[PDB]
Design a binder for these strands. Structure first.
Lengths: 96, 159, 145, 92, 100, 204, 232, 74
RNA sequence: GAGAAGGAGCCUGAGAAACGGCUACUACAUCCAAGGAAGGGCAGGCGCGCAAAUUACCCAAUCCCGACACGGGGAGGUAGUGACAAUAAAUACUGAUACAGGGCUCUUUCGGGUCUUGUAAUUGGAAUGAGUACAAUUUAAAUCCCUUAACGAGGAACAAUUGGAGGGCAAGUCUGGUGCCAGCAGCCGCGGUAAUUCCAGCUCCAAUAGCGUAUAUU
């Protein structure tokens, strides 16, 4: 996207926590708002029990997607100033 | 490059090194040497630059004993390789000179500083050896193989 | 140092076991090892060496033998010395040159050829086969300073 | 425990005698330069109070230690010709 | 001319060169083996140290950065006991001296 | 090109959420939490700080001590006692937090506890650490190594590249003056409180 | 505060004396025609070790330069100044080598008592008095009348009177104290006037090498007559 | 009378997947994989392994199949 | 090369039109008892509310200035931080016994190939640096280094990671459909936390003191 590698955002209002199956990508989508423009785009989180870490209005950092809603583009690395893989290996807890 | 994989592994396994970092490093050395060999062939025969520089480099290699005292020409300077550089690598000399039963035991010995070359004890197993020095490798006096104190385990077992 | 009866220092550089050593009133050494055919002039308190390699070069030609081993040494003055190699080679040397000054072969000649009676257990002793004599070579050397 | 003093100079105009002093403790621990000044009072027939040693680098591998001993003709010559930090290291 | 200096040093000069002993020129637990030129530099350092028998500060940060910079910019590698130049303008000096 | 890439990365980090400010033109005295383990001289830091700021030795300083240090702003220094409960009080209060650490002992459990609770309820404006009672070290190598490791652990717990000052001895029974001075230097250069929704919705 | 690299090369200094070199005090000799006394004693002759060491040795009256005690540390000692040290009892003269670098001759009082000083200029002073200015910037009242420029004079150094003189002579051995061929011992064989400025001489060595040197930087030593003992 | 912290919070590993000796030293892991691969090589082709037995020859100690050709056809 | 808040004038000295001073004008701006009075530098931290290199020490050497051997020196050098790179290299070595009988490999696969391998077995050996460290040394004083006495490895420890592929499951949960299927996956099960000791620490692969991912791209 854009002109830089990562971009910032707020998460707007989660869809797909009404998702029926445990691990479907229509659970793992989330709705972010791109700050540099104000856009509404669609991003991933790599595991259900870490979507649980992304809560609404907590600073969220997104980046590309490289590899069942084919062609979502965005996934999220640092949450509120601490990395997602960090939180989900339970290294450091979440500061809001 | 599964051939790269298996070839590097066989290098380490035949000489029990530690990582492909160290193996690639010695390969880089070989690459610089064969670069020199290529250049000194690019100058044609009986040229003075060729004569003196090639005589020099061959003396360098035979001084560290990697290229044999038999064969002393730029052809074999090209023909050298990593197995030979590993042959003059140090820990191999402990194993082939019969102090450590295994290459790994030799590695441990070099760690706890029991062999020396000439005077000083050595800690780095990748200390390259020289042809002129390679037979002057033995245990130090401070090591229980060479003597000195019997060691801490003998100390505690006597305790 | 015998004065306090202690070890002070060692020196390495010899591919062979050193066979002989000579010295003088100064702080130097010379030390010959055999199969390398090599003398080493030790500069002691500075701990350096000077390497000297021999390379040995009306009779049967086969009996003439090159410098087989390197047995004896005699340091004569501060600058010259001599070596004796067991193929009968007697070689004056200088510190100032890489080369021997003067070597002579068969310094004690050849050995006596053995009998056919003990060389072969044959009722016919035939000199048609017989080994060439080896050069009767140096066992010991001495000089006065 | 053994000693040699190479390169000895009189220094008559500075009233001090300078030997490149090599001390060798094979297998012994380190040196105690004050005990060295005591010993060098005897070694060069002086008193400990007009000698002062500095330098004192032990070589690699233990044993030999190179030091620089200064023998003044008087302890007052040492006092007038000596560095401040060297004097308080001697203990004066 | 350095290659020429080594050739005339060992090959044609009927005067044997003094070699240092094996174990002395090992620098730091094996992490260094002393080459001839900087070994001579070490000898120069120690002989100056015994001239006025003064002590030195071990090489300060600026000369350290300088010589490390020359090394990082330099076409010479110290593999084992030996040094290894690359083969540009020193060899061209050999060529020019031979035409002379 | 690479200029443009780096600069848009710079603005990318220059972004955050758009929260509303709600700080009055005469803002209240912003609060410093002093917090540490028992037996740490929480009291001593308070004493030396108030002396550096007020020239007035307090032989037993307690309670909220309020001090001006620039024509704009001013602070209330307050320590925690050795209870988690008052720790959670001053935690939900705070805006800048000095955390004091014991040196040769290593970490204390209440220290890491309070670190956690401050982490959850909210990272406030600024947090700094003071590594103290350093003269309980014979060995310079030991002291420097301990400084290195506690810097690293405190960094990953707090954030990367934090602020950890050092306080060598206890001189007059007071502190080292130069160390506490440049401490005051870094803490008096001040920043606005960081917008936690609690401290921008309610009164306290 | 100049650098050891900015220090001139005819007075020697190794790589370990610190980055700076002391500047010489002003006096008879010129700045670049000077070896300071500390550079003599502790850097060339190594008799002392430190700045304060040299300082103290010169604060006590132990050394006399040209028969007179000198106390300032960086006094100009430029060329063939005699330096006595009575503790060792040895005197020193300051000459060049063939390489154009400073050299020091150990000597006793017998040759050390006099100086072969190069005449700079003769004049008629106040009261009409003839006086003489030599290379050491020494003036002499009432000299012998024959000595004009480019002559040297043997000087008593204790009364400081004239003891002899050597005339400027194409046929006399001389010494070079300047220029690109500085410090070359040979015989003046020719002289070219070049009236209009910067005249020269042609001077060959003892071993058939002739070269053109300026009469400014020339310096005679004797026809043969080695009046100062050159080291062998 | 203080309260220490443990190896855990000094090294906040937490929920890492657990590993072995063989992994933990990357010197050892290329020893064993070199051993087992060399054992794995001892399946397909034929290694030399010394001469006949020092006590002597003892037959083709593991069978002979007749009808099997192992010649590269040129 | 030009300047020491801005123009103008003056003052010492060997050397200044010092920017050292005085005077006026201008312009700020300090204390005040209201009458007065002195004065104008760099360095640092922020520069979004989110961030990353000492506020170290000495003139010990070299050098410089003075009534002057001593005094002072913003040169100089000493020390601290470091995955930005780069360098060397630990996190183990080795038997003996017992026991099990497959281990592995593949063009061509309901088919072939080759022979000692494994075991979470029981035990024996040595080896020790990292840490700890008496000192002595070093040094302006310290530190580092060199030495160096003494402690100092049995796994559950003196605890190596990051990355990907894949296998096995419930009295558990959910989405389909012409019964048993099939999927999604599943930290959740009945109980139970001082309870449970289980894939008992599963297998593969790569790089391992490091290594990933996005973006630009060559």
């Amino acid at each position: 996207f854009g002109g830089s590698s990562h971009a910032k955002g707020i998460v707007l209002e989660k869809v797909g926590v009404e998702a029926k199956q445990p691990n479907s990508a229509i659970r793992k989508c989330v709705r972010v708002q791109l700050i540099k423009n104000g856009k509404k785009v669609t991003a991933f989180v790599p595991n259900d029990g870490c979507l649980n870490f992304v809560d609404e209005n907590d600073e969220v950092l997104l980046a590309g997607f490289g590899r069942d809603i084919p062609g979502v583009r965005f996934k999220v690395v640092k949450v509120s100033g601490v990395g997602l893989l960090a939180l989900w290996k339970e290294k450091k807890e979440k500061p809001r | 490059e599964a051939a790269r994989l298996d070839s590097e592994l066989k290098l380490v396994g035949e000489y029990g090194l530690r990582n492909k970092r160290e193996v690639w490093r010695v390969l880089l050395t070989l690459s610089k040497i064969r670069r020199a060999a290529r250049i000194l062939l690019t100058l044609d025969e009986k040229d003075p630059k060729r004569l003196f520089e090639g005589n020099a480099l061959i003396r360098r290699l035979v001084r560290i004993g990697v290229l044999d005292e038999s064969r002393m020409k730029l052809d074999y300077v090209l023909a050298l390789k990593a197995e030979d550089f590993l042959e003059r690598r140090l820990q191999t000399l402990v194993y082939k000179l019969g102090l450590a039963k295994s290459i790994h035991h030799a590695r441990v010995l070099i760690r706890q500083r029991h062999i020396r070359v000439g005077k000083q004890i050595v800690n780095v197993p990748s200390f390259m050896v020289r042809l002129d020095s390679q037979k002057h490798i033995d245990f130090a006096l401070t090591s229980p193989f060479g003597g000195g104190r019997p060691g801490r385990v003998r100390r505690k077992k006597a305790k | 140092s015998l004065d306090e009866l202690a070890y002070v220092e060692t020196l390495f550089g010899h591919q062979d076991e050193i066979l002989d050593i000579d010295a003088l009133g100064q702080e130097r050494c010379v030390s010959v090892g055999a199969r390398d055919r090599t003398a080493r002039y030790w500069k002691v308190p500075e701990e350096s060496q000077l390497v000297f390699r021999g390379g040995g070069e009306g009779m049967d030609p086969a009996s003439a033998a090159h410098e087989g081993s390197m047995d004896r040494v005699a340091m004569i003055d501060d600058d010259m010395f001599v070596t004796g190699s067991d193929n009968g080679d007697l070689a004056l040397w200088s510190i100032q040159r890489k080369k021997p000054l003067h070597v002579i072969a068969r310094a004690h000649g050849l050995e006596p050829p053995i009998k056919l009676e003990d060389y072969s257990a044959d009722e016919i002793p035939d000199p048609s086969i017989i080994p060439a004599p080896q050069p009767r070579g140096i066992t010991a050397l001495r000089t006065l300073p | 425990v053994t000693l040699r003093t190479r390169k000895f100079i009189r220094n008559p105009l500075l009233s001090r005698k300078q030997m490149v002093v090599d001390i060798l403790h094979p297998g012994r621990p380190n040196i105690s330069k004050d005990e060295l000044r005591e010993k060098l009072a005897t070694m060069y027939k002086a008193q400990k109070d007009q000698v002062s040693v500095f330098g004192l680098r032990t070589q690699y591998g233990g044993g030999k230690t190179t030091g620089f001993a200064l023998i003044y003709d008087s302890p007052e010559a040492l006092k007038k010709f000596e560095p401040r930090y060297r004097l308080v290291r001697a203990g004066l | 001319s350095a290659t020429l200096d080594e050739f005339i040093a060992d090959e044609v000069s009927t005067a044997p060169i003094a070699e240092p002993s094996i174990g002395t020129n090992i620098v730091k637990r094996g992490r260094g083996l002393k080459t001839a030129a900087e070994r001579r530099m070490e000898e120069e350092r120690r002989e100056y140290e015994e001239t006025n028998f003064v002590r030195l500060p071990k090489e300060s940060k600026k000369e350290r950065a300088k010589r490390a910079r020359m090394e990082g910019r330099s076409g010479r590698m110290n593999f084992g006991g030996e040094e290894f130049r690359e083969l540009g303008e020193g060899a061209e000096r050999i060529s020019r001296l031979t035409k002379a | 090109a690479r200029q443009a890439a780096r600069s848009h990365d710079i603005k990318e980090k220059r972004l955050h959420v758009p929260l509303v400010d709600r700080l009055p033109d005469e803002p209240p005295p912003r609060l410093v939490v002093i917090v540490g383990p028992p037996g740490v001289g929480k009291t001593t830091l308070l004493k030396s700080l108030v002396r550096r700021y007020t020239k007035e030795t307090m032989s037993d300083p307690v309670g909220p001590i309020t001090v001006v240090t620039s024509k704009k702003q001013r602070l209330t220094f307050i320590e925690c006692p050795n209870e988690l409960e008052a720790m959670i009080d001053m935690a939900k209060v705070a805006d800048i937090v000095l955390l004091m650490i014991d040196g040769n002992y290593g970490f204390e459990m209440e220290t890491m506890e309070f670190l956690n609770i401050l982490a959850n309820t909210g990272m406030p404006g600024n947090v700094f650490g003071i590594l103290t009672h350093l003269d309980l070290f014979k060995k310079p190598s030991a002291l420097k190594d301990a400084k290195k490791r506690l810097k690293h652990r405190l960094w990953t717990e707090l954030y990367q590249g934090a602020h950890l000052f050092y306080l060598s001895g206890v001189l007059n029974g007071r502190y080292p003056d130069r160390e506490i001075h440049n401490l005051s230097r870094f803490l008096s250069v001040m920043k606005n409180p960081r917008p936690l929704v609690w401290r921008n919705t309610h009164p306290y | 505060h100049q650098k050891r690299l900015s220090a001139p090369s005819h007075w020697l200094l190794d790589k370990l004396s610190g980055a700076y070199a002391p500047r010489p005090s002003t006096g008879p000799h010129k700045l670049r025609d000077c070896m300071p006394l500390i550079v003599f004693v502790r850097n060339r002759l190594k008799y002392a070790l430190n700045y304060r060491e040299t300082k103290a040795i010169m604060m006590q009256r132990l050394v006399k330069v040209d028969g007179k005690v000198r106390t300032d540390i960086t006094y100009p000692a430029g060329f063939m100044d005699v330096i006595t040290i009575e503790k060792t009892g040895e005197n020193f003269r300051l000459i060049y080598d063939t390489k154009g670098r400073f050299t020091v001759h150990r000597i006793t009082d017998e040759e050390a008592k006099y100086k072969l000083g190069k005449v700079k200029r003769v004049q008629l002073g106040r009261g009409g008095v003839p006086f003489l200015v030599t290379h050491d910037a020494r003036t002499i009242r009432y000299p012998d009348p024959l000595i004009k420029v480019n002559d040297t004079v043997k000087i008593d150094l204790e009364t400081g009177k004239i003891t002899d003189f050597i005339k400027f002579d194409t046929g006399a051995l001389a010494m070079i104290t300047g220029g690109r061929n500085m410090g070359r011992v040979g015989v003046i064989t020719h002289r070219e006037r070049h009236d209009g400025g910067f005249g020269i001489v042609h001077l060959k060595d003892a071993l058939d090498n002739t070269f053109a040197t300026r009469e400014s930087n020339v310096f005679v030593i004797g026809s043969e007559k080695p009046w100062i003992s050159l080291p062998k | 009378g203080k309260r220490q912290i443990t190896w855990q919070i000094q090294k906040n590993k937490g929920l890492t997947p657990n590993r072995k000796k063989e992994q933990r030293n990357p010197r050892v892991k290329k020893r064993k994989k070199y051993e087992e691969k060399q054992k794995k090589l001892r399946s397909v082709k034929a290694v030399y392994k010394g001469g006949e037995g020092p006590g002597g020859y003892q037959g083709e100690l593991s069978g002979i199949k007749t009808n099997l050709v192992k010649s590269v056809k040129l």
